[PDB]
Amino acid sequence: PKEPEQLRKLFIGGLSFETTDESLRSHFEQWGTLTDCVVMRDPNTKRSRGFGFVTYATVEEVDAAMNARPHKVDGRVVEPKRAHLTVKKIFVGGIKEDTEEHHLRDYFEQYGKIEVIEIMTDRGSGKKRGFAFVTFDDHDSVDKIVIQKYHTVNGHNCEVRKAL
Ligand SMILES: CCNc1ccc(C)nn1
């Protein structure tokens, strides 16, 4: 059936205070069907809080919207994020001693543009320790990676988390 609603949402920060439900929707409907679109407002003044959210029908639509950044909405470049600890680096554990840089590259390059691959080695012996760090040029790669239940790299079932 339908992917969980939480995984179909984009929070949108940095809105122009003149953006409305209607103008935010007209913008983001370019990349898919929107089931919901709200600008957050003060309950008493109705003045914009400067952020909102949109909900797409599918995760592929969320991907399309993030691939179309930067978004200029009503004259202002906004900041869309998936459902925040916003980082560009992941820890990859469980890769043992036989996983190479090209294994990590070939797998993770389909999530985002890779800038650094660091396979960790023992400070004394030089032996591989069984984990690595991958740095991307942008946070959405990481956000897509860490919501997956599973990552299989070089036949290993890997543990992947955000790295600070
Ligand atoms: C040690 C390998 N480092 C990297 C960095 C970036 C890319 C794309 N591939 N490999």
XYZ file of N, CA, C and O and ligand atoms in Angstrom:
666
model
N 0.815 -1.219 0.000
C 0.000 0.000 0.000
C 0.849 1.270 0.000
O 1.882 1.331 -0.660
N 0.408 2.266 0.759
C 1.034 3.578 0.783
C 2.172 3.596 1.799
O 2.053 3.034 2.893
N 3.278 4.239 1.433
C 4.357 4.428 2.386
C 3.837 5.235 3.570
O 2.928 6.048 3.410
N 4.406 5.043 4.758
C 4.006 5.854 5.917
C 4.057 7.349 5.632
O 5.013 7.861 5.045
N 3.005 8.045 6.067
C 2.893 9.489 5.858
C 4.134 10.241 6.325
O 4.592 11.176 5.655
N 4.689 9.853 7.480
C 5.871 10.539 8.005
C 7.008 10.590 6.994
O 7.751 11.576 6.938
N 7.158 9.536 6.177
C 8.242 9.470 5.198
C 7.919 10.218 3.909
O 8.773 10.303 3.026
N 6.724 10.787 3.794
C 6.307 11.533 2.614
C 6.262 13.040 2.854
O 5.856 13.791 1.954
N 6.668 13.494 4.034
C 6.586 14.901 4.418
C 7.888 15.627 4.125
O 8.983 15.074 4.268
N 7.772 16.906 3.783
C 8.933 17.774 3.765
C 8.621 18.949 4.669
O 7.577 19.595 4.512
N 9.466 19.160 5.675
C 9.425 20.405 6.423
C 10.102 21.453 5.552
O 11.060 21.154 4.832
N 9.597 22.677 5.581
C 10.105 23.728 4.694
C 10.391 24.937 5.574
O 9.465 25.645 5.977
N 11.683 25.192 5.866
C 12.051 26.361 6.646
C 12.431 27.546 5.780
O 12.628 27.431 4.567
N 12.537 28.709 6.430
C 12.966 29.914 5.749
C 11.957 30.505 4.790
O 12.347 31.167 3.831
N 10.665 30.282 5.021
C 9.642 30.797 4.130
C 9.592 32.316 4.189
O 9.832 32.934 5.234
N 9.252 32.921 3.059
C 8.793 34.301 3.114
C 7.510 34.384 3.944
O 6.628 33.528 3.846
N 7.411 35.423 4.780
C 6.177 35.626 5.548
C 4.957 35.845 4.654
O 3.823 35.717 5.128
N 5.143 36.165 3.374
C 3.990 36.316 2.496
C 3.561 35.004 1.836
O 2.525 34.974 1.169
N 4.302 33.919 2.021
C 3.882 32.631 1.476
C 2.643 32.123 2.205
O 2.536 32.221 3.433
N 1.706 31.577 1.437
C 0.433 31.064 1.934
C 0.347 29.573 1.657
O 1.154 29.012 0.908
N -0.657 28.928 2.263
C -0.943 27.537 1.908
C -1.017 27.377 0.397
O -0.460 26.427 -0.177
N -1.685 28.326 -0.262
C -1.926 28.233 -1.691
C -0.649 28.427 -2.495
O -0.407 27.679 -3.446
N 0.198 29.399 -2.127
C 1.412 29.616 -2.922
C 2.461 28.537 -2.660
O 3.206 28.158 -3.575
N 2.517 28.004 -1.436
C 3.431 26.901 -1.152
C 3.024 25.663 -1.941
O 3.874 24.963 -2.507
N 1.711 25.398 -2.013
C 1.207 24.255 -2.774
C 1.464 24.417 -4.269
O 1.899 23.467 -4.932
N 1.167 25.601 -4.828
C 1.403 25.805 -6.254
C 2.856 25.568 -6.608
O 3.153 25.010 -7.672
N 3.775 25.966 -5.723
C 5.189 25.710 -5.961
C 5.506 24.219 -5.952
O 6.074 23.685 -6.911
N 5.184 23.535 -4.857
C 5.684 22.176 -4.701
C 4.855 21.143 -5.447
O 5.303 19.998 -5.577
N 3.676 21.510 -5.971
C 2.960 20.567 -6.828
C 3.682 20.319 -8.145
O 3.287 19.407 -8.884
N 4.734 21.082 -8.455
C 5.508 20.802 -9.659
C 6.203 19.445 -9.603
O 6.517 18.882 -10.657
N 6.458 18.902 -8.407
C 7.205 17.648 -8.294
C 6.373 16.475 -7.786
O 6.930 15.382 -7.574
N 5.069 16.648 -7.614
C 4.208 15.521 -7.315
C 2.878 15.955 -6.739
O 2.612 17.151 -6.523
N 2.034 14.947 -6.496
C 0.725 15.166 -5.882
C 0.889 15.489 -4.402
O 1.564 14.755 -3.680
N 0.297 16.595 -3.946
C 0.349 16.963 -2.534
C -0.959 16.611 -1.839
O -2.011 17.176 -2.160
N -0.876 15.728 -0.842
C -2.034 15.424 -0.010
C -2.229 16.423 1.122
O -3.323 16.473 1.705
N -1.218 17.233 1.435
C -1.350 18.223 2.495
C -0.300 19.302 2.255
O 0.760 19.026 1.683
N -0.603 20.525 2.694
C 0.299 21.665 2.512
C -0.160 22.784 3.444
O -1.256 23.331 3.258
N 0.655 23.103 4.453
C 0.276 24.078 5.478
C 1.438 25.020 5.759
O 2.592 24.593 5.872
N 1.123 26.306 5.924
C 2.069 27.293 6.437
C 1.745 27.472 7.918
O 0.578 27.694 8.281
N 2.749 27.330 8.787
C 2.501 27.530 10.213
C 2.390 29.014 10.525
O 3.163 29.829 10.009
N 1.393 29.361 11.354
C 1.059 30.745 11.659
C 0.822 30.904 13.153
O 0.421 29.959 13.841
N 1.048 32.129 13.643
C 0.693 32.457 15.017
C -0.821 32.333 15.232
O -1.611 32.825 14.418
N -1.259 31.724 16.340
C -2.706 31.519 16.553
C -3.483 32.808 16.792
O -4.701 32.839 16.543
N -2.831 33.875 17.261
C -3.524 35.127 17.543
C -3.371 36.151 16.425
O -4.360 36.752 16.005
N -2.156 36.351 15.912
C -1.923 37.369 14.889
C -2.112 36.870 13.466
O -2.177 37.692 12.547
N -2.124 35.551 13.258
C -2.075 34.913 11.942
C -0.808 35.253 11.155
O -0.698 34.881 9.980
N 0.159 35.939 11.758
C 1.425 36.173 11.064
C 2.189 34.862 10.924
O 2.262 34.067 11.864
N 2.787 34.664 9.747
C 3.562 33.459 9.458
C 4.678 33.247 10.476
O 5.329 34.200 10.913
N 4.887 31.984 10.847
C 6.039 31.572 11.640
C 7.273 31.319 10.780
O 8.347 31.015 11.321
N 7.156 31.465 9.462
C 8.316 31.304 8.602
C 8.638 29.872 8.231
O 9.720 29.609 7.691
N 7.762 28.923 8.538
C 7.983 27.560 8.070
C 6.639 26.893 7.852
O 5.595 27.389 8.293
N 6.692 25.758 7.158
C 5.519 24.955 6.900
C 5.933 23.543 6.534
O 7.077 23.135 6.744
N 4.971 22.788 6.012
C 5.272 21.444 5.543
C 4.351 21.089 4.387
O 3.246 21.620 4.256
N 4.808 20.147 3.575
C 4.025 19.614 2.470
C 4.105 18.102 2.607
O 5.094 17.563 3.124
N 3.056 17.415 2.156
C 3.019 15.951 2.158
C 2.741 15.469 0.744
O 1.688 15.782 0.180
N 3.673 14.694 0.187
C 3.510 14.118 -1.141
C 2.804 12.768 -1.066
O 2.726 12.136 -0.015
N 2.320 12.300 -2.226
C 1.656 10.997 -2.284
C 2.629 9.820 -2.188
O 2.229 8.730 -1.758
N 3.882 9.993 -2.626
C 4.866 8.916 -2.643
C 6.236 9.454 -2.246
O 6.509 10.666 -2.308
N 7.091 8.528 -1.818
C 8.470 8.861 -1.468
C 9.251 9.303 -2.702
O 10.086 10.212 -2.618
N 9.011 8.668 -3.868
C 9.670 9.126 -5.089
C 9.389 10.597 -5.371
O 10.263 11.310 -5.884
N 8.189 11.081 -5.030
C 7.901 12.501 -5.190
C 8.728 13.362 -4.240
O 9.215 14.431 -4.638
N 8.880 12.935 -2.975
C 9.779 13.642 -2.057
C 11.178 13.735 -2.665
O 11.805 14.802 -2.665
N 11.687 12.606 -3.190
C 13.004 12.598 -3.832
C 13.061 13.614 -4.967
O 14.058 14.331 -5.127
N 12.007 13.668 -5.788
C 11.993 14.602 -6.912
C 12.076 16.037 -6.423
O 12.799 16.866 -7.000
N 11.318 16.345 -5.374
C 11.363 17.685 -4.805
C 12.752 17.996 -4.241
O 13.290 19.087 -4.468
N 13.361 17.054 -3.510
C 14.703 17.350 -3.014
C 15.736 17.421 -4.132
O 16.693 18.207 -4.039
N 15.543 16.676 -5.216
C 16.505 16.784 -6.301
C 16.374 18.091 -7.063
O 17.310 18.458 -7.786
N 15.270 18.818 -6.889
C 15.057 20.091 -7.556
C 15.475 21.299 -6.712
O 15.251 22.442 -7.139
N 16.100 21.085 -5.549
C 16.692 22.190 -4.809
C 17.788 22.832 -5.663
O 18.391 22.165 -6.504
N 18.083 24.124 -5.455
C 17.475 25.036 -4.478
C 16.099 25.490 -4.912
O 15.865 25.756 -6.094
N 15.179 25.591 -3.959
C 13.828 26.072 -4.205
C 13.717 27.538 -3.804
O 13.949 27.891 -2.643
N 13.364 28.384 -4.766
C 13.032 29.780 -4.500
C 11.523 29.892 -4.539
O 10.911 29.667 -5.586
N 10.932 30.184 -3.384
C 9.485 30.193 -3.194
C 9.090 31.608 -2.827
O 9.514 32.118 -1.784
N 8.287 32.235 -3.685
C 7.820 33.598 -3.472
C 9.006 34.534 -3.240
O 8.976 35.415 -2.382
N 10.093 34.293 -3.977
C 11.240 35.172 -3.993
C 12.325 34.851 -2.988
O 13.332 35.575 -2.930
N 12.157 33.803 -2.192
C 13.086 33.486 -1.120
C 13.536 32.034 -1.242
O 12.716 31.136 -1.461
N 14.838 31.789 -1.094
C 15.330 30.416 -1.125
C 14.980 29.761 0.205
O 15.358 30.253 1.274
N 14.240 28.659 0.145
C 13.781 27.979 1.355
C 14.646 26.760 1.661
O 15.569 26.425 0.907
N 14.364 26.096 2.789
C 15.168 24.965 3.270
C 14.287 23.750 3.520
O 13.762 23.571 4.627
N 14.122 22.876 2.524
C 13.332 21.655 2.723
C 14.164 20.566 3.375
O 15.341 20.389 3.049
N 13.544 19.844 4.317
C 14.173 18.691 4.962
C 13.134 17.600 5.181
O 11.977 17.895 5.496
N 13.550 16.343 5.047
C 12.681 15.244 5.445
C 12.470 15.237 6.961
O 13.237 15.826 7.726
N 11.419 14.543 7.392
C 11.170 14.314 8.821
C 12.313 13.553 9.500
O 12.711 12.464 9.070
N 15.519 18.064 13.901
C 16.321 17.450 12.844
C 17.810 17.626 13.163
O 18.262 18.728 13.497
N 18.570 16.536 13.085
C 20.015 16.575 13.304
C 20.660 16.505 11.923
O 20.820 15.424 11.352
N 20.997 17.664 11.366
C 21.307 17.775 9.942
C 22.806 17.655 9.713
O 23.559 18.602 9.929
N 23.234 16.490 9.235
C 24.653 16.218 9.046
C 24.869 15.588 7.681
O 23.943 15.074 7.048
N 26.133 15.596 7.249
C 26.521 15.095 5.937
C 27.383 13.835 6.014
O 27.865 13.379 4.983
N 27.551 13.242 7.201
C 28.485 12.138 7.401
C 27.775 10.981 8.099
O 26.939 11.201 8.988
N 28.094 9.748 7.677
C 27.549 8.545 8.292
C 28.677 7.661 8.798
O 29.765 7.595 8.215
N 28.371 6.954 9.885
C 29.116 5.791 10.349
C 28.546 4.544 9.675
O 27.321 4.377 9.616
N 29.425 3.689 9.151
C 29.044 2.410 8.534
C 29.778 1.313 9.289
O 31.004 1.194 9.174
N 29.037 0.506 10.048
C 29.654 -0.559 10.819
C 29.293 -1.950 10.335
O 28.304 -2.130 9.617
N 30.083 -2.942 10.731
C 29.837 -4.316 10.344
C 30.433 -4.738 9.021
O 30.019 -5.767 8.475
N 31.394 -3.983 8.478
C 31.939 -4.295 7.162
C 33.131 -5.243 7.231
O 33.643 -5.647 6.178
N 33.595 -5.589 8.436
C 34.663 -6.565 8.637
C 35.961 -6.135 7.966
O 36.185 -4.940 7.746
N 36.831 -7.096 7.654
C 38.166 -6.793 7.156
C 38.275 -6.813 5.635
O 39.309 -6.396 5.102
N 37.249 -7.275 4.923
C 37.338 -7.463 3.479
C 36.591 -6.414 2.661
O 36.534 -6.535 1.432
N 36.021 -5.389 3.287
C 35.298 -4.360 2.549
C 36.248 -3.234 2.149
O 37.003 -2.729 2.984
N 36.203 -2.853 0.872
C 37.103 -1.897 0.237
C 36.367 -0.595 -0.050
O 35.142 -0.518 0.071
N 37.121 0.431 -0.467
C 36.483 1.719 -0.747
C 35.474 1.614 -1.882
O 34.396 2.210 -1.808
N 35.783 0.843 -2.924
C 34.873 0.765 -4.059
C 33.557 0.085 -3.690
O 32.520 0.407 -4.275
N 33.566 -0.818 -2.702
C 32.313 -1.406 -2.220
C 31.414 -0.326 -1.645
O 30.213 -0.257 -1.950
N 31.987 0.513 -0.785
C 31.226 1.596 -0.175
C 30.818 2.630 -1.216
O 29.689 3.139 -1.187
N 31.733 2.965 -2.137
C 31.435 3.952 -3.172
C 30.292 3.501 -4.070
O 29.355 4.261 -4.337
N 30.393 2.280 -4.605
C 29.415 1.808 -5.572
C 28.025 1.749 -4.964
O 27.032 1.998 -5.655
N 27.941 1.427 -3.677
C 26.650 1.381 -3.000
C 26.143 2.773 -2.649
O 25.011 3.135 -2.989
N 26.965 3.577 -1.980
C 26.444 4.830 -1.442
C 26.345 5.968 -2.453
O 25.609 6.931 -2.183
N 27.012 5.879 -3.613
C 26.936 6.954 -4.598
C 25.529 7.133 -5.150
O 25.206 8.211 -5.664
N 24.679 6.114 -5.036
C 23.298 6.254 -5.474
C 22.430 6.990 -4.467
O 21.277 7.303 -4.790
N 22.951 7.291 -3.270
C 22.246 8.151 -2.321
C 22.663 9.614 -2.414
O 21.870 10.507 -2.065
N 23.887 9.886 -2.854
C 24.338 11.267 -2.929
C 25.762 11.322 -3.430
O 26.419 10.295 -3.639
N 26.229 12.544 -3.637
C 27.589 12.744 -4.127
C 28.556 12.584 -2.962
O 28.469 13.313 -1.969
N 29.496 11.661 -3.094
C 30.427 11.333 -2.021
C 31.648 12.241 -2.118
O 32.224 12.412 -3.204
N 32.046 12.829 -0.981
C 33.280 13.610 -0.934
C 34.419 12.927 -0.188
O 35.575 13.155 -0.539
N 34.136 12.111 0.826
C 35.174 11.425 1.597
C 34.727 10.004 1.911
O 33.590 9.782 2.342
N 35.635 9.043 1.740
C 35.440 7.686 2.230
C 36.627 7.357 3.115
O 37.777 7.419 2.665
N 36.357 7.023 4.366
C 37.420 6.756 5.331
C 37.196 5.371 5.938
O 36.367 5.209 6.836
N 37.949 4.375 5.462
C 37.900 3.034 6.036
C 38.862 2.988 7.216
O 40.050 3.303 7.068
N 38.362 2.584 8.382
C 39.112 2.774 9.618
C 40.068 1.616 9.858
O 39.718 0.443 9.678
N 41.283 1.963 10.274
C 42.344 0.994 10.497
C 42.914 1.187 11.891
O 42.842 2.276 12.471
N 43.500 0.114 12.414
C 44.045 0.140 13.762
C 45.292 1.016 13.803
O 46.166 0.927 12.931
N 45.355 1.884 14.815
C 46.450 2.839 14.945
C 47.792 2.137 15.130
O 48.821 2.656 14.691
N 47.798 0.966 15.766
C 49.034 0.226 15.998
C 49.456 -0.748 14.911
O 50.639 -0.810 14.563
N 48.506 -1.517 14.372
C 48.794 -2.609 13.449
C 48.454 -2.302 12.004
O 48.926 -3.014 11.110
N 47.643 -1.275 11.752
C 47.149 -1.030 10.418
C 46.045 -1.957 9.961
O 45.592 -1.829 8.819
N 45.595 -2.885 10.801
C 44.534 -3.792 10.391
C 43.211 -3.057 10.301
O 42.950 -2.118 11.050
N 42.369 -3.502 9.377
C 41.050 -2.901 9.259
C 40.208 -3.214 10.485
O 40.221 -4.331 11.001
N 39.481 -2.205 10.968
C 38.713 -2.359 12.189
C 37.263 -2.754 11.947
O 36.569 -3.094 12.905
N 36.793 -2.717 10.709
C 35.444 -3.159 10.427
C 34.403 -2.070 10.408
O 33.212 -2.373 10.552
N 34.803 -0.813 10.248
C 33.825 0.256 10.081
C 34.467 1.377 9.276
O 35.680 1.384 9.025
N 33.625 2.304 8.825
C 34.071 3.369 7.944
C 33.175 4.584 8.142
O 32.090 4.492 8.725
N 33.638 5.721 7.631
C 32.821 6.924 7.549
C 32.737 7.402 6.106
O 33.740 7.415 5.380
N 31.532 7.787 5.688
C 31.306 8.353 4.364
C 30.737 9.752 4.543
O 29.765 9.933 5.281
N 31.346 10.735 3.871
C 30.895 12.129 3.873
C 30.343 12.495 2.502
O 30.994 12.249 1.478
N 29.143 13.065 2.488
C 28.460 13.497 1.281
C 28.524 15.014 1.167
O 28.924 15.708 2.102
N 28.109 15.535 0.015
C 28.106 16.986 -0.152
C 26.834 17.636 0.358
O 26.717 18.866 0.282
N 25.907 16.853 0.914
C 24.604 17.386 1.274
C 23.899 16.412 2.210
O 24.092 15.191 2.129
N 23.042 16.969 3.072
C 22.439 16.205 4.156
C 21.349 15.255 3.700
O 21.034 14.318 4.445
N 20.730 15.480 2.530
C 19.575 14.645 2.203
C 19.994 13.215 1.926
O 19.230 12.295 2.212
N 21.194 13.019 1.371
C 21.745 11.680 1.208
C 21.663 10.914 2.517
O 21.138 9.795 2.569
N 22.193 11.516 3.588
C 22.207 10.877 4.906
C 20.790 10.614 5.395
O 20.488 9.532 5.923
N 19.904 11.599 5.241
C 18.522 11.425 5.685
C 17.832 10.261 4.980
O 17.043 9.545 5.603
N 18.085 10.078 3.681
C 17.557 8.902 2.986
C 18.177 7.612 3.522
O 17.490 6.593 3.675
N 19.477 7.631 3.814
C 20.177 6.419 4.227
C 19.664 5.927 5.576
O 19.370 4.738 5.750
N 19.547 6.828 6.556
C 19.301 6.347 7.914
C 17.857 5.944 8.162
O 17.577 5.330 9.204
N 16.928 6.228 7.239
C 15.567 5.742 7.443
C 15.348 4.355 6.851
O 14.324 3.726 7.155
N 16.292 3.833 6.068
C 16.173 2.465 5.567
C 16.310 1.478 6.718
O 17.131 1.675 7.618
N 15.540 0.377 6.664
C 15.702 -0.665 7.676
C 17.016 -1.420 7.513
O 17.604 -1.841 8.519
N 17.485 -1.605 6.267
C 18.615 -2.479 5.966
C 19.601 -1.804 5.019
O 19.214 -1.040 4.128
N 20.881 -2.122 5.206
C 21.914 -1.805 4.222
C 22.810 -3.021 4.046
O 23.375 -3.517 5.025
N 22.915 -3.513 2.808
C 23.771 -4.644 2.468
C 24.912 -4.147 1.596
O 24.679 -3.629 0.496
N 26.136 -4.279 2.100
C 27.332 -3.833 1.398
C 28.361 -4.952 1.445
O 28.726 -5.410 2.531
N 28.843 -5.370 0.273
C 29.840 -6.444 0.173
C 29.345 -7.697 0.893
O 30.094 -8.377 1.597
N 28.048 -7.977 0.748
C 27.416 -9.112 1.393
C 27.210 -8.999 2.888
O 26.665 -9.930 3.490
N 27.628 -7.900 3.515
C 27.492 -7.726 4.952
C 26.232 -6.929 5.256
O 25.902 -5.981 4.540
N 25.548 -7.299 6.335
C 24.425 -6.522 6.849
C 24.985 -5.441 7.768
O 25.483 -5.742 8.859
N 24.898 -4.186 7.332
C 25.613 -3.089 7.963
C 24.717 -2.270 8.880
O 23.508 -2.145 8.662
N 25.343 -1.687 9.894
C 24.706 -0.736 10.792
C 25.138 0.665 10.367
O 26.333 0.944 10.267
N 24.178 1.526 10.057
C 24.501 2.856 9.551
C 23.811 3.897 10.420
O 22.607 3.796 10.691
N 24.565 4.905 10.849
C 23.999 5.979 11.648
C 24.656 7.299 11.270
O 25.739 7.333 10.680
N 23.986 8.390 11.642
C 24.557 9.720 11.500
C 25.833 9.839 12.332
O 25.899 9.343 13.462
N 26.852 10.487 11.762
C 28.129 10.733 12.431
C 28.345 12.232 12.608
O 28.180 13.001 11.655
N 28.744 12.637 13.815
C 28.938 14.060 14.146
C 30.397 14.514 14.076
O 31.316 13.715 14.258
C 39.477 7.042 -0.329
C 38.416 7.155 -1.390
N 37.748 8.439 -1.327
C 36.767 8.815 -2.162
C 36.199 10.094 -2.103
C 35.194 10.397 -2.997
C 34.800 9.425 -3.899
C 33.715 9.667 -4.906
N 35.365 8.226 -3.921
N 36.352 7.910 -3.044
